[PDB]
């Protein structure tokens, strides 16, 4: 599994469950490449596959919006946006939500 | 000023300053039109980039070149860039700051809104 994505509720104090979350790739435009819900656990596992995540640079779309949204929050942001350049020189991307802000960081061991 | 930018460096512990920023908004057939930009100055703020005339309700991305930063310091960072999505001025005009905060494998942003 060589791209995770953690969400967390920062307003809740819990996981951000059942949140969309797409990855594009970049091709000069942006290429659909996975996607999925996070789990109770705010979690999305299994999204690509170490053949299929190459080199390039990856845009993490985290479907904040919806979230919010779904439990009658109003929210600042579309969506959070994480672009980053995959090289091979293992990434967790997590999240950390609030209305009218977030927080992100790479975990690369 | 209804749309400021302020960039701080949490490992220097000081503004991020000559950090680039370019703003785009959705057009009318879902892509990104160049909307402002502008470079942060020594306080890490960036002023001007529109003004109330121009700055109408849509869908406006701001794009924080947090790569050249990093690199023109030394550090190899994670991220092209910090990005901030949102709607503005959806219910009437408002003042909005966006906020950043760098870290080469990490960033936060936050929106101020004004009335
Ligand atoms: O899976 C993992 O690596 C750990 C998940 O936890 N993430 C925490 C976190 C993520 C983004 C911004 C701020 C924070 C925090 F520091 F505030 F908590
Ligand atoms: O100019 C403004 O409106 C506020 C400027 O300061 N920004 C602070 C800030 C921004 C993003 C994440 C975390 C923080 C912080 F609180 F942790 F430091």
Redesign the pocket.
């Given at each position: 599994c060589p791209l995770?994505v953690?969400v967390?509720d920062?307003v809740r104090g819990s996981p951000a469950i059942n949140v969309a979350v797409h990855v594009f790739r970049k091709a000069d435009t942006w290429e659909p490449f996975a996607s999925g819900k996070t789990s109770e656990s705010?979690?999305l596992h299994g999204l690509t596959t170490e053949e299929e995540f190459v080199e390039g640079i990856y845009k993490v779309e985290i479907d904040t919006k919806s979230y919010w949204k779904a439990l009658g929050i109003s929210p600042f942001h579309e969506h959070a946006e994480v672009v980053f350049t995959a090289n091979d020189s293992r990434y967790?991307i997590?999240?950390?939500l609030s209305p009218y802000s977030?927080?992100?960081?790479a975990?690369v061991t």
């Open positions: 995770m953690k967390l920062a705010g979690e967790t997590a999240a950390l977030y927080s992100t960081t975990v």
